[PDB]
């Protein structure tokens, strides 16, 4: 199988027609484990603004502004870290994928 360095993520990925959604498996303090959306080089995508559904605790990302377009679809690069520390090398890095849609 094609190797993946993704650690476990406490959530469920859904590639909708409208958007990308990540449903968290439980409610938690976003300040201490905070996601940011980055490009291929790891820089934060400043034009990306995601939404947090507070009822079901779901992250919502638009395809156009928060993903990297590739031939077969969309790469979704998410870095998650504790914002109360300066220590970034303890962050978790995830690379997810959504297939091309019409």
């Amino acid at each position: 199988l094609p190797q993946s360095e993704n650690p476990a993520f406490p959530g469920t990925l859904i590639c909708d027609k409208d958007e990308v959604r990540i449903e968290f498996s439980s409610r938690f303090d976003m300040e201490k484990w905070n996601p940011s959306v980055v490009d291929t080089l790891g820089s934060e995508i400043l034009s990306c603004t995601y939404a947090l559904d507070l009822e079901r605790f779901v992250l919502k990302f638009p395809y156009e502004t928060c993903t990297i377009k590739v031939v077969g679809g969309y790469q979704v690069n998410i870095r998650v870290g504790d914002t109360t520390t300066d220590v970034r090398y303890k962050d978790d890095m995830y690379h997810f994928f959504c297939p091309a849609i019409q």
Partner: antibody
Amino acid sequence: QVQLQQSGAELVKPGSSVKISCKASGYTFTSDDMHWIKQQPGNGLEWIGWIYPGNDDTKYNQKFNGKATLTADKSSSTVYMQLSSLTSEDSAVYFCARGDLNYGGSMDAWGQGTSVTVSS
Amino acid sequence: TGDTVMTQSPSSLAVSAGETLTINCKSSQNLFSSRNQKNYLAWFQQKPGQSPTLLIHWASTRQSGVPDRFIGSGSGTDFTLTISSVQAEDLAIYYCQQYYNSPLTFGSGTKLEIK
């Protein structure tokens, strides 16, 4: 005043294991990371892993998975690295370094190094 | 794969006392944290028989006691260490390192010489 004191040089046979130590002073032992770094003669610096003595969390360079094991003792403020299944490629100088969490974990203080030679 | 690669250059350099020189470090990943507006890159100096010495952190902030003739600059993926008015005591091997991503990684080093 921040000081890291490593144990003395080691000379061992292939196949064995060694446990080297790093005693820290001058700062709150449980507040910072402790990194370990490998330097083969003439081949620069290679990061092995870190341990956080506050809760014994560890993170390893996957190249050293199963090769290095990090432990910490709060009472003596001492971090230990155990290298197993020693080979000639493990002969190197090993440094401990404080990861100063106030400044993002930068390695601002180093031990003097522990030379480890493996020969049959 | 996926590790941040630090490409340092040149591998060795020979200069006369008093001149100014620059060492280059290129990162395969961006090292800039939007959270605190800092580049997670450090510069180290290592003399024979000694442990590495931290010269610079946050890519441009000198450690206390480090002479102001060491100048770290750059951002994103491109960084430089400049020594203005090189001195005999500056002869050493210099390493760049990123501490933004795990595993932490070093450049291959630049050995600084005279003549």
